[PDB]
């Protein structure tokens, strides 16, 4: 199944009353932050509040990325979730303001389920006998039909090779995709026609297909700008046509959710565009993440501010606290990886690995869980014993023992 | 010329597809779907569906056609232009070559591709028609219509040979 680094996330475990369970979907800890993120996912699912900002204040090494992934998995596939690395902003050819604004347009999306009839082409109905009137038959495996087409489609027909045995896909907006060499063309058992040899296209003539599709506005802007957007003519036209599409009853808007990591490592001009553009009435909700604490804002060289965030940006932002843990549940979290791994472990090796986890950090034990099972597979043991983990604790060193040597 | 007729009537049948059953017929070193015995026996190969393939495509000889599926569609264009759903919607399979299994579905699938979907077509293969004109002759002779139009002697001598044209 190709399990990634963390695959514990399958939910967030919120009940109807609004309580937080002790162990739900491998997310043990922080019931206050559990309720604080339940409030904001209810705010996302309520579809009434846009223009908010969430900061996850905590020490480095708590696992707030798993909390954001739990938010994204509770939302699922309906709400578009696009995380942004802080190093995705520093571009060379495109300015950073436009990158942040295009991320804000990646947030906002719509869904306008529709229809589309397929035509699929007969074999040979090249009848230009009028040019306004073209008769094209169809010979599919279900049977034969005919249709009259206005001259165009035919002007797309003579552009491509229309010979004995071709496919003609005709869309609703005169979008013709054509092939060559179908059905049968083996006349005298001769050489290559150098075409595509496809069997019979089983299926009838007239289907009525319905697809629910989520469309982002940035793909719309890319498809409309080409045959840095103007904020007086282009995006206002997009806003007007989306207003017309939702007033006629075609598309349905969904709110935008973003998640930004290493926010404090951005430039101060990105900050003064960020807390100016989140003041708009159309601004999506963006969950910010600050990694380290009190440092210097990039571009100031003297201004001291907490969490690397200026005073104008630190205001009007909700703050959720994520503190450290207690060691007596660390052996539980390793167990959450064990049922993810598929190989059961013993009881004393869990104790030694929990001792190594409470020695320096939990992530060191989580990363050493994999070579323990690897040496258990090499040596032939069905479970992980204490000798393999006590050998891999001495063979592989962390940053503290590397700074000690 | 008599045991081979029994092999044709007992072993040979009409397959579904010709190219697909040609693709499957290779690497037949262990699959018991092709080889079968009779009475020399003298083990046979995959020609049990290539023989009824001649009726569907005569291209191996080079006499006339390359099937049967297309001539019925290319031939029946008559006054029943208002009478064409009278024409095609009643197909009667009879004779001796319709004894092979797998014939009805393949003939229906080959005539379905060249005639419209909305036409309520019906391809019916009964179980009786080994002697089917005999059944028609014994049905008409018992439905008291033979004595109404009688064409015999008393009329062959009074009218020389002009007696079996206007009546029948």
């Amino acid at each position: 199944q190709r399990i990634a680094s963390h695959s514990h996330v399958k939910g967030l475990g919120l009940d109807e009353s609004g309580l937080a369970k002790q162990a739900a979907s491998g997310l043990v800890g922080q019931e206050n932050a559990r309720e604080a993120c339940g409030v904001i996912v209810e705010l996302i699912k309520s579809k009434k509040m846009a223009g908010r900002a969430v900061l996850l204040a905590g020490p480095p090494g708590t696992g707030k990325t798993a909390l954001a992934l739990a938010i994204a998995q509770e939302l699922g596939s309906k709400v578009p979730f696009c995380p942004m690395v802080g190093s995705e902003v520093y571009s060379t050819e495109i300015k950073k303001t436009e990158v942040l604004m295009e991320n804000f347009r990646r947030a906002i999306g719509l869904r306008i389920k529709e229809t589309k009839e397929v035509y699929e082409g007969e074999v040979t109905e090249l009848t230009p006998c009028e040019i306004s009137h073209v008769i094209i038959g169809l010979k599919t495996a279900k049977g034969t039909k005919q249709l009259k087409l206005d001259p165009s489609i035919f002007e797309s027909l003579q552009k491509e090779r229309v010979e004995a045995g071709d496919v003609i896909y005709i869309e609703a907006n005169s979008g013709a995709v054509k092939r060559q060499g179908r059905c049968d063309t083996y006349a005298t058992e001769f050489d290559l026609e150098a075409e595509e040899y496809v069997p019979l296209p089983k299926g009838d003539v007239h289907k009525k297909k319905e697809i629910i599709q989520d469309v982002t506005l940035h793909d719309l802007d890319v498809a409309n700008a080409r045959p840095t957007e103007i904020t007086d003519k282009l995006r206002g036209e997009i806003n007007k046509v989306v207003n017309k599409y939702i007033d006629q009853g075609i598309a349905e808007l969904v709110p935008g959710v973003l998640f930004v990591d290493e926010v404090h490592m951005l430039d101060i001009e990105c900050f003064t565009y960020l807390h100016r553009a989140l003041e708009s009435s159309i601004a999506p909700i963006v969950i910010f993440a600050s990694n380290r604490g009190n440092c210097v804002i990039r571009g100031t060289e003297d201004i001291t501010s907490p969490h690397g965030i200026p005073l104008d940006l630190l205001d009007r932002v909700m703050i959720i606290r994520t503190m450290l843990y207690t060691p007596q549940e660390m052996k539980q979290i390793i167990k959450i990886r064990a049922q993810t791994e598929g190989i059961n472990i013993s009881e004393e090796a869990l104790n030694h690995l929990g001792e190594i986890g409470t020695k320096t950090t939990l992530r060191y034990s989580v990363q050493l869980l994999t070579p323990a099972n690897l040496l258990a597979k090499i040596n032939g043991k069905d479970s992980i014993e204490k000798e393999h983990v006590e050998e891999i604790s001495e063979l592989f060193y962390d940053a503290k023992s590397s700074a000690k040597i | 010329t008599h045991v081979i007729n029994q092999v044709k009537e007992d072993v040979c049948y009409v397959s579904q597809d010709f190219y697909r059953d040609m693709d499957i017929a290779k690497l037949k070193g262990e699959e018991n779907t092709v080889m079968i015995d009779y009475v020399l026996i003298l083990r046979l190969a995959n020609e049990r569906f290539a023989v009824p393939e001649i009726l569907f495509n005569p291209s191996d000889i080079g006499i006339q056609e390359m099937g049967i599926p297309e001539a019925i569609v290319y031939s029946i264009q008559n006054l029943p232009e208002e009478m064409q759903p009278h024409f095609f919607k009643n197909i009667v399979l009879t004779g001796g070559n319709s004894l092979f299994p797998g014939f009805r579905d393949r003939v229906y699938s080959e005539v379905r591709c060249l005639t419209p979907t909305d036409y309520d077509v019906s391809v019916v293969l009964p179980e009786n028609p080994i002697t089917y004109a005999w059944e028609g002759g014994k049905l008409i002779s018992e439905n008291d219509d033979f004595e109404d139009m009688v064409v015999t002697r008393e009329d062959y001598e009074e009218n020389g040979h002009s007696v079996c044209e206007e009546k029948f």
């Binding site: 907006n173 | 759903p85 036409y119 309520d120």
Partner: peptide
Amino acid sequence: RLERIFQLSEAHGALAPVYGTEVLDFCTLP
């Protein structure tokens, strides 16, 4: 038994230009 089939064929051949005018309305109004 053909007359109901001709009525259904005329029904399809009447509803198909209705969908054609619907395509023209969704392509020429917005």
